[PDB]
Amino acid sequence: PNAKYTTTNYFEFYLPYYWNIAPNMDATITPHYMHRRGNIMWENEFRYLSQAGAGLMELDYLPSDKVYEDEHPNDRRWLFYWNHSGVMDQVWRFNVDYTKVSDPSYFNDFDNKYGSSTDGYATQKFSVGYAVQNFNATVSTKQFQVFSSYSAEPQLDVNYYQNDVGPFDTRIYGQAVHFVNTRDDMPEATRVHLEPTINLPLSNNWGSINTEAKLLATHYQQTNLDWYNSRNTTKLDESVNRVMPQFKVDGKMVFERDMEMLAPGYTQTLEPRAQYLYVPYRDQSDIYNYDSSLLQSDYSGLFRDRTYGGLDRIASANQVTTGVTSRIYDDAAVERFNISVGQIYYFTESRTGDDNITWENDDKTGSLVWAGDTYWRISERWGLRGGIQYDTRLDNVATSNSSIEYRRDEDRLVQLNYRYASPEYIQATLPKYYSTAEQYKNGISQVGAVASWPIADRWSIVGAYYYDTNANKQADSMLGVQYSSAIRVGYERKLNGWDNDKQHAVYDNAIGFNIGTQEMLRSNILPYQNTL
Amino acid sequence: CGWHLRDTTQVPSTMKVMILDSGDPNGPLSRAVRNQLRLNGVELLDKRKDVPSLRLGKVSIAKDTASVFRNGQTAEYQMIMTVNATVLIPGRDIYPISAKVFRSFFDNPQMALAKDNEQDMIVKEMYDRAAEQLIRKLPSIRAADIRS
């Protein structure tokens, strides 16, 4: 058995039965008793190995929920989850990444392995790939059950590659997708995209320069436009053909230096990189945005050919992105440290016709995106990471994060971490009610601490604590103890909702008993990530 | 100052001919590694019995909630990719190496499909950074093999 207490659900206990009926597949059936509810939840986990790959199913079911029947009057609870991944022979890339719940609130209510109170939707995916060295083709379905929704149904992605066509290497990417909405009144599309690409890779010992050209060609057939076009001043068109050249140059050098002044026989490296990108302006305000979110610009992200993550927005470009990295290697040529800093200079506004974003500044030209990374492998037990993103259009640091970590062993570690995102960045990049609602508008300014240590030969103690520096309140805290042979005991407090008229957070508190440091460090929201 | 242009290749000259081995030769990592080796000018051989073999091993990817809003709902995911690999040099030792890449993005429950396109595009970039990270371990394997 296993047992629990929580502020959400009072006393709980579990009576797991394990069922073995084949050498390659098995099941766990567990009647999950609860005290705040009147009924047993039945949870049913199934595991299999197959020629098609390895996968996991879960089916959780309440015949009736007394709390839901009182809290949603005048109206069962269940979760189904499936995950599969494989490559059959060496060519058939089969995958499933699917979950479905009866209602939005299931993850505020029930602790489970396969979703979180932290989630804004349940994802629902299937795909079949065929892949070989020169060619791949993938058929996929992308659906989302939103809790607070467009689907791709189906999507086809195809790639072909052909090297050595003279001095050039070449590829073509093509896609066909049908977009459907959960609402009967939203636009529909079928989109066809074609992207032939040619590049000339030149290199030697001290540097390289890659010159690349694409044609971006997209066809839209759009339907169900009447509800949108009767409400908006700029109209969607029933057919749209978008055709755009892209040109890119990506030059690099490497310099080195004797680091003997720091330590015996150490090596320093300096790597300036300077990329030019051009894409002409095409108005896309007559194309509805089904899949293109604005992208986050970390230091490696300074070198993209995309400002948005999909195909419905493709920003004009006439820009130089300029960076520099330097590295230190020790006498054994192991990398001890690196720092990278770079920026994007725009000679013309990065416009997309549907220029929907809100900025603190009215200028659009000159040096205005900056980013940097650093890493230091201080020793084989200590390591430090940092990142910063700055945007002159926000007049602020847009995002930052840092961590420092000590590990002696899988059981003996301490980590500190920090994450920041500005109020102006949340305003610019997220749904326009996030700029106003008190739980969202204040950015992020989160401090985290994590530790594990054996307190005696057989006894491990684990804990975590996350704090919001703007709220002056904890986001999560966790404590865990185990005795090995084995028994394990845990505690958690987490944010688990909000109270709307009172404008304060709801906290779930829980205590658990079971009959392991890494399993405990994984168990909370905000779970432990090894940063060495 | 004291800076000089790098006067030797980024891949050590005992590894400008190499064998590439994987349990998934057609997948995204093997394609990114093969691209990064070929871009450096490595002559890659079929699975010359005296040539060193780079064997790609277990790969894992996770997305975790890195951050939360004041209602306890995700702000940022962090994605972490771990790649194990090993270089077998014939008539010498086996040299295990790895890469570890960290990327972040904000969620959006409106435009969930767009954030799934952003996630697939970021995982594509992470295989290129994991490939770059593995190639920078090849100079240390030359130094370690001479010191063996």
Author numbering:
A (entry chain A): 231 to 305, 309 to 381, 387 to 723, 727 to 756, 768 to 784
B (entry chain B): 19 to 65, 69 to 169
Original paper wording:
We purified both LptDEM and the core translocon LptDE via nickel-affinity chromatography and gel filtration. As baits, we used respectively LptMHis expressed in wild-type cells or LptEHis expressed in ΔlptM cells. Notably, both eluates contained an additional protein migrating at an apparent molecular mass of approximately 15 kDa. Bottom-up mass spectrometry on the corresponding gel bands identified this protein as LptY, an OM lipoprotein of ~14 kDa38. Using cryo-EM and single particle analysis, we determined the structures of the purified OM LPS translocon complexes in n-dodecyl-β-D-maltopyranoside (DDM) micelles. The structure of the core complex, LptDE, was solved at an overall resolution of 2.74 Å for the transmembrane portion including the LptD β-barrel and LptE. However, in the reconstructed maps, no density was visible for the LptD β-taco domain, indicating conformational flexibility of this domain as previously documented. The membrane portion of the core translocon was superimposable with that of the holo-complex, resulting in an RMSD lower than 0.1 Å for the largest portion of LptE and the LptD β-barrel domain.
